[PDB]
Design a protein around this motif. Structure first.
Motif, PDB file in Angstrom:
ATOM      1  N   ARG D  24       0.826  -1.202   0.000  1.00 30.14           N
ATOM      2  CA  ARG D  24       0.000   0.000   0.000  1.00 30.14           C
ATOM      3  C   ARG D  24       0.863   1.255   0.000  1.00 30.14           C
ATOM      4  O   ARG D  24       0.581   2.211  -0.731  1.00 30.14           O
ATOM      5  CB  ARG D  24      -0.941  -0.009   1.202  1.00 30.14           C
ATOM      6  CG  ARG D  24      -1.495   1.359   1.562  1.00 30.14           C
ATOM      7  CD  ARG D  24      -2.943   1.271   2.003  1.00 30.14           C
ATOM      8  NE  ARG D  24      -3.178   0.163   2.921  1.00 30.14           N
ATOM      9  CZ  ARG D  24      -2.911   0.197   4.219  1.00 30.14           C
ATOM     10  NH1 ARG D  24      -2.398   1.272   4.793  1.00 30.14           N
ATOM     11  NH2 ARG D  24      -3.170  -0.876   4.961  1.00 30.14           N
ATOM     12  N   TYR D  25       1.923   1.269   0.810  1.00 31.11           N
ATOM     13  CA  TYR D  25       2.836   2.408   0.807  1.00 31.11           C
ATOM     14  C   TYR D  25       3.554   2.541  -0.529  1.00 31.11           C
ATOM     15  O   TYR D  25       3.726   3.654  -1.041  1.00 31.11           O
ATOM     16  CB  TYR D  25       3.846   2.281   1.945  1.00 31.11           C
ATOM     17  CG  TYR D  25       3.268   2.576   3.307  1.00 31.11           C
ATOM     18  CD1 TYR D  25       2.103   3.318   3.440  1.00 31.11           C
ATOM     19  CD2 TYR D  25       3.893   2.126   4.460  1.00 31.11           C
ATOM     20  CE1 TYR D  25       1.573   3.592   4.681  1.00 31.11           C
ATOM     21  CE2 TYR D  25       3.369   2.399   5.706  1.00 31.11           C
ATOM     22  CZ  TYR D  25       2.210   3.131   5.810  1.00 31.11           C
ATOM     23  OH  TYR D  25       1.684   3.404   7.050  1.00 31.11           O
ATOM     24  N   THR D  26       3.988   1.420  -1.109  1.00 35.87           N
ATOM     25  CA  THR D  26       4.717   1.490  -2.372  1.00 35.87           C
ATOM     26  C   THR D  26       3.843   2.036  -3.491  1.00 35.87           C
ATOM     27  O   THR D  26       4.313   2.826  -4.318  1.00 35.87           O
ATOM     28  CB  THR D  26       5.266   0.119  -2.763  1.00 35.87           C
ATOM     29  OG1 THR D  26       4.183  -0.801  -2.939  1.00 35.87           O
ATOM     30  CG2 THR D  26       6.229  -0.400  -1.706  1.00 35.87           C
ATOM     31  N   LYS D  27       2.573   1.620  -3.539  1.00 31.58           N
ATOM     32  CA  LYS D  27       1.688   2.041  -4.620  1.00 31.58           C
ATOM     33  C   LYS D  27       1.715   3.553  -4.803  1.00 31.58           C
ATOM     34  O   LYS D  27       2.155   4.053  -5.843  1.00 31.58           O
ATOM     35  CB  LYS D  27       0.258   1.563  -4.358  1.00 31.58           C
ATOM     36  CG  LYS D  27       0.050   0.060  -4.480  1.00 31.58           C
ATOM     37  CD  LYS D  27       0.174  -0.426  -5.919  1.00 31.58           C
ATOM     38  CE  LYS D  27       1.513  -1.113  -6.160  1.00 31.58           C
ATOM     39  NZ  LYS D  27       1.625  -1.663  -7.537  1.00 31.58           N
ATOM     40  N   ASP D  32       2.752   8.189  -8.151  1.00 24.92           N
ATOM     41  CA  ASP D  32       3.313   9.534  -8.130  1.00 24.92           C
ATOM     42  C   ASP D  32       4.479   9.667  -9.102  1.00 24.92           C
ATOM     43  O   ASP D  32       4.767  10.772  -9.577  1.00 24.92           O
ATOM     44  CB  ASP D  32       3.769   9.901  -6.721  1.00 24.92           C
ATOM     45  CG  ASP D  32       4.359  11.295  -6.648  1.00 24.92           C
ATOM     46  OD1 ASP D  32       3.815  12.198  -7.316  1.00 24.92           O
ATOM     47  OD2 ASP D  32       5.371  11.485  -5.944  1.00 24.92           O
ATOM     48  N   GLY D  33       5.149   8.562  -9.416  1.00 20.37           N
ATOM     49  CA  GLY D  33       6.351   8.580 -10.225  1.00 20.37           C
ATOM     50  C   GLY D  33       7.611   8.194  -9.483  1.00 20.37           C
ATOM     51  O   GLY D  33       8.692   8.219 -10.082  1.00 20.37           O
ATOM     52  N   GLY D  34       7.511   7.836  -8.205  1.00 26.49           N
ATOM     53  CA  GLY D  34       8.662   7.411  -7.444  1.00 26.49           C
ATOM     54  C   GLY D  34       9.082   5.996  -7.786  1.00 26.49           C
ATOM     55  O   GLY D  34       8.453   5.294  -8.576  1.00 26.49           O
ATOM     56  N   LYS D  35      10.182   5.574  -7.172  1.00 25.63           N
ATOM     57  CA  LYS D  35      10.774   4.276  -7.444  1.00 25.63           C
ATOM     58  C   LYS D  35      11.094   3.564  -6.139  1.00 25.63           C
ATOM     59  O   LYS D  35      11.147   4.172  -5.068  1.00 25.63           O
ATOM     60  CB  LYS D  35      12.048   4.403  -8.287  1.00 25.63           C
ATOM     61  CG  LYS D  35      11.911   5.301  -9.501  1.00 25.63           C
ATOM     62  CD  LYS D  35      10.936   4.712 -10.501  1.00 25.63           C
ATOM     63  CE  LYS D  35      10.911   5.517 -11.788  1.00 25.63           C
ATOM     64  NZ  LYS D  35      10.068   4.869 -12.831  1.00 25.63           N
ATOM     65  N   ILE D  36      11.302   2.255  -6.246  1.00 31.21           N
ATOM     66  CA  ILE D  36      11.763   1.424  -5.142  1.00 31.21           C
ATOM     67  C   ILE D  36      13.071   0.780  -5.565  1.00 31.21           C
ATOM     68  O   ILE D  36      13.153   0.183  -6.644  1.00 31.21           O
ATOM     69  CB  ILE D  36      10.731   0.348  -4.762  1.00 31.21           C
ATOM     70  CG1 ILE D  36       9.410   0.996  -4.359  1.00 31.21           C
ATOM     71  CG2 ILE D  36      11.257  -0.507  -3.628  1.00 31.21           C
ATOM     72  CD1 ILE D  36       9.530   1.893  -3.169  1.00 31.21           C
ATOM     73  N   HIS D  37      14.091   0.902  -4.723  1.00 29.80           N
ATOM     74  CA  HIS D  37      15.398   0.331  -5.015  1.00 29.80           C
ATOM     75  C   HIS D  37      15.752  -0.848  -4.127  1.00 29.80           C
ATOM     76  O   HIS D  37      16.290  -1.840  -4.620  1.00 29.80           O
ATOM     77  CB  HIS D  37      16.480   1.405  -4.892  1.00 29.80           C
ATOM     78  CG  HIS D  37      16.433   2.425  -5.984  1.00 29.80           C
ATOM     79  ND1 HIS D  37      15.831   2.181  -7.199  1.00 29.80           N
ATOM     80  CD2 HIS D  37      16.910   3.689  -6.047  1.00 29.80           C
ATOM     81  CE1 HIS D  37      15.942   3.252  -7.965  1.00 29.80           C
ATOM     82  NE2 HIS D  37      16.593   4.181  -7.290  1.00 29.80           N
ATOM     83  N   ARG D  38      15.460  -0.770  -2.833  1.00 36.64           N
ATOM     84  CA  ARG D  38      15.706  -1.882  -1.930  1.00 36.64           C
ATOM     85  C   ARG D  38      14.559  -1.988  -0.944  1.00 36.64           C
ATOM     86  O   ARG D  38      14.114  -0.978  -0.394  1.00 36.64           O
ATOM     87  CB  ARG D  38      17.027  -1.713  -1.173  1.00 36.64           C
ATOM     88  CG  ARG D  38      17.301  -2.827  -0.178  1.00 36.64           C
ATOM     89  CD  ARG D  38      18.686  -2.712   0.415  1.00 36.64           C
ATOM     90  NE  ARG D  38      18.771  -1.620   1.376  1.00 36.64           N
ATOM     91  CZ  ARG D  38      19.897  -1.010   1.715  1.00 36.64           C
ATOM     92  NH1 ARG D  38      21.058  -1.361   1.187  1.00 36.64           N
ATOM     93  NH2 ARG D  38      19.858  -0.028   2.610  1.00 36.64           N
ATOM     94  N   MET D  62      13.429   0.373   3.788  1.00 34.16           N
ATOM     95  CA  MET D  62      13.101   0.660   2.398  1.00 34.16           C
ATOM     96  C   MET D  62      13.919   1.839   1.891  1.00 34.16           C
ATOM     97  O   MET D  62      14.038   2.862   2.570  1.00 34.16           O
ATOM     98  CB  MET D  62      11.600   0.921   2.229  1.00 34.16           C
ATOM     99  CG  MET D  62      11.075   2.148   2.944  1.00 34.16           C
ATOM    100  SD  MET D  62       9.289   2.332   2.784  1.00 34.16           S
ATOM    101  CE  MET D  62       8.713   1.035   3.873  1.00 34.16           C
ATOM    102  N   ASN D  63      14.482   1.688   0.698  1.00 37.05           N
ATOM    103  CA  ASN D  63      15.190   2.761   0.012  1.00 37.05           C
ATOM    104  C   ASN D  63      14.354   3.175  -1.188  1.00 37.05           C
ATOM    105  O   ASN D  63      14.043   2.343  -2.046  1.00 37.05           O
ATOM    106  CB  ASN D  63      16.583   2.313  -0.424  1.00 37.05           C
ATOM    107  CG  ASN D  63      17.515   2.102   0.745  1.00 37.05           C
ATOM    108  OD1 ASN D  63      17.551   1.026   1.337  1.00 37.05           O
ATOM    109  ND2 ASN D  63      18.280   3.130   1.081  1.00 37.05           N
ATOM    110  N   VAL D  64      13.988   4.454  -1.248  1.00 37.83           N
ATOM    111  CA  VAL D  64      13.017   4.928  -2.222  1.00 37.83           C
ATOM    112  C   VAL D  64      13.544   6.163  -2.933  1.00 37.83           C
ATOM    113  O   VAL D  64      14.479   6.827  -2.483  1.00 37.83           O
ATOM    114  CB  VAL D  64      11.654   5.251  -1.578  1.00 37.83           C
ATOM    115  CG1 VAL D  64      11.163   4.092  -0.741  1.00 37.83           C
ATOM    116  CG2 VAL D  64      11.759   6.505  -0.739  1.00 37.83           C
TER     117      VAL D  64
END
Ligand SMILES: [Mg+2]
Ligand SMILES: [Mg+2]
Ligand SMILES: [Mg+2]
Ligand SMILES: [Mg+2]
Ligand SMILES: [Mg+2]
Ligand SMILES: [Mg+2]
Ligand SMILES: [Mg+2]
Ligand SMILES: [Mg+2]
Ligand SMILES: [Mg+2]
Ligand SMILES: [Mg+2]
Ligand SMILES: [Mg+2]
Ligand SMILES: [Mg+2]
Ligand SMILES: [Mg+2]
Ligand SMILES: [Mg+2]
Ligand SMILES: [Mg+2]
Ligand SMILES: [Mg+2]
Ligand SMILES: [Mg+2]
Ligand SMILES: [Mg+2]
Ligand SMILES: [Mg+2]
Ligand SMILES: [Mg+2]
Ligand SMILES: [Mg+2]
Ligand SMILES: [Mg+2]
Lengths: 62, 62, 119, 106
Positions: D24-27, D32-38, D62-64
RNA sequence: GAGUACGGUAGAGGGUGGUGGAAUUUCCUGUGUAGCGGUGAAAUGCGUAGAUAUAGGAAGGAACACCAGUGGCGAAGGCGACCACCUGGACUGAUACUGACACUGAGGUGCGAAAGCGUGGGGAGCAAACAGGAUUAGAUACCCUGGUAGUCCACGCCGUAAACGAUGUCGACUAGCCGUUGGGAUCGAUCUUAGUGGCGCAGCUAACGCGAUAAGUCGACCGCCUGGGGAGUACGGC
């Protein structure tokens, strides 16, 4: 910390950090461990930062 | 500053080990430090005098 | 008239530059017996000596022997004399000491202490 | 955007919706256009001191990549949730992807 | 000489929000009983209307142990919990660029510890004034028991300190030795750069002492002094 590993001391690596805290829980002075001043400052900030997240205790008693 | 009596040692080893741990933790020094308010001028003076004595003693060793 | 039994208690020594206070309780923090240096008959400059602390600790231990209490942990707190005479008197009462801890409260920055005396 | 590193621990009694809370947080930052790296789940540990009268927690790391809007909304989500207990946001100058400690003990 | 463009570092430099842990004080409750507190000795004071001590809970404010160091940053005053956001300067390397664009500075403008003042919040600890207890020939004090403005915050004023390195800013030269802070090179060692300390040859000084962070040898500009009191006072101006 300059030879092979740990370019910047990390708050997550508890194994390194626990080697620089006494049994009471305080930060050991740099004049005892022989650590360089810059790396000693990095240890201080890392220890405080991990202390906030409760990975390490503020005091042995609590 | 906390010890345990383990494997039936006499109550003279435990007391001295407790004293040694208390001395290492600097308890009494901390209690004497905060008995009264030491204005920052006096604290700076004490630090300067301590640094002067430390450097003079270190130089005299050679 | 009423009595009670308890074992494995905790003894708190509260030292200071003027007087020492000994209190034996159970592990839940409920007092059983207590003794001081002013209550042992010293009342002055003699009240601030390790001998008075020794006497107070023995008196409190003899008072607490009614409940049994074959085991004691020790909590010392304070800068005054008698920080150790009470601890050595407690075993002389006939107890068995599991451990000793120091629980002196140290502020990290805290409030400011009083002025310095000009004597 | 900007790189950010977040350590987020959760109340032990709620340690069953944590995964769902994670996607839910990642969505939101994804749309928005953000990314997830780790992403790392090394929770169910022992606290060094009592926090809100609990002694265990569920840690996530989490690294965002995010902008001010995404970070602000995620941080408010941390503010007004009740399983959030504690939080840390520690912006870094780069991106990292390969583990911190996982479970080094065998 | 002075500046600009480009990578990279170190930092209690500044401002706006949020959050931690230790401790004090007050309140509620359980255990428990006669002392606590203070002193050179005491007493005032607090307690059988149940104190001190010990355990559990809550509220609130302020200061950030250890790291911490002749350490760092800032024009100075000054700046120590952690995180995010906005933001100034310094140091460091190579190449390119402008081409004297510089230094000082009467007036003038701005920043400026603490105390203090105005309006509005806040109130834990400490504490001018104040009250009581001692001491004393007396004690409007030192010591003890309490305690209000203040100390904290927002905005505005005040513009003073042994505001000190008692040493104006800028630039150039002059043996060395030992530390330490932030970087570069060459092969732990050598060289070099901008700070920060201890010695010391010349030289200087009345002496003490300074001595590449000069008080040495020289340039540019500004401020200030002319025996001690009266006096940094009186009168006038702002
Ligand atoms: Mg006093
Ligand atoms: Mg109480
Ligand atoms: Mg309590
Ligand atoms: Mg001016
Ligand atoms: Mg002020
Ligand atoms: Mg005022
Ligand atoms: Mg007034
Ligand atoms: Mg006022
Ligand atoms: Mg007011
Ligand atoms: Mg008072
Ligand atoms: Mg005021
Ligand atoms: Mg002046
Ligand atoms: Mg002057
Ligand atoms: Mg000058
Ligand atoms: Mg100059
Ligand atoms: Mg000069
Ligand atoms: Mg010069
Ligand atoms: Mg010299
Ligand atoms: Mg002269
Ligand atoms: Mg004259
Ligand atoms: Mg005048
Ligand atoms: Mg006038």
């Amino acid at each position: 910390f300059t030879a092979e590993g740990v370019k910047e001391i990390d708050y997550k690596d508890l194994n390194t950090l626990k080697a620089y805290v006494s049994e009471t829980g305080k930060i050991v002075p740099s004049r005892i461990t022989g650590t360089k001043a810059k790396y000693q400052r990095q240890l201080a900030t890392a220890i405080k930062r991990a202390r906030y997240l409760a990975l390490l205790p503020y005091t042995d008693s609590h | 500053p906390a010890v345990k009596v383990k494997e039936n040692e006499p109550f003279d080893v435990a007391l001295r080990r407790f004293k040694r741990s208390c001395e290492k933790a600097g308890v009494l020094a901390e209690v004497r430090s905060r008995e009264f308010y030491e204005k920052p001028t006096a604290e700076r003076k004490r630090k300067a005098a301590a640094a002067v004595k430390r450097h003079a003693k270190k130089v005299q060793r050679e | 008239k009423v009595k009670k039994t308890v074992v494995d208690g905790i003894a708190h020594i509260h030292a200071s530059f003027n007087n020492t206070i000994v209190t034996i309780t159970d592990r839940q923090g409920n007092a059983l017996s207590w003794a001081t240096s002013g209550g042992s008959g010293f009342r002055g400059s003699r009240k601030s000596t390790p001998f008075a602390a020794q006497v107070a600790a023995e008196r409190a231990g003899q008072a607490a022997l009614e409940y049994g209490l074959k085991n004691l942990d020790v909590n010392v707190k304070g800068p005054g004399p008698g920080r150790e005479s009470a601890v050595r008197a407690l075993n002389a009462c006939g107890y068995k000491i599991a451990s000793i801890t120091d629980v002196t409260p140290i502020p990290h920055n805290g409030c400011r202490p009083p002025k310095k005396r000009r004597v | 955007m900007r790189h950010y590193e977040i350590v987020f621990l959760v109340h032990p009694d709620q340690s069953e919706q944590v995964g769902g809370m994670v996607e839910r947080y990642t969505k939101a930052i994804e749309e928005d256009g953000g990314k997830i790296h780790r992403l790392e789940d090394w929770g169910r540990r022992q606290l060094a001191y009592a926090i809100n009268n609990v002694h265990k927690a569920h840690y996530v790391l989490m690294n965002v990549e995010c902008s001010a809007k995404a970070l602000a909304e995620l941080e408010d989500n941390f503010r007004y949730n009740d399983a959030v207990i504690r939080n840390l946001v520690m912006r870094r100058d780069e991106a990292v992807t390969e583990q911190s400690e996982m479970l080094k003990a065998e």
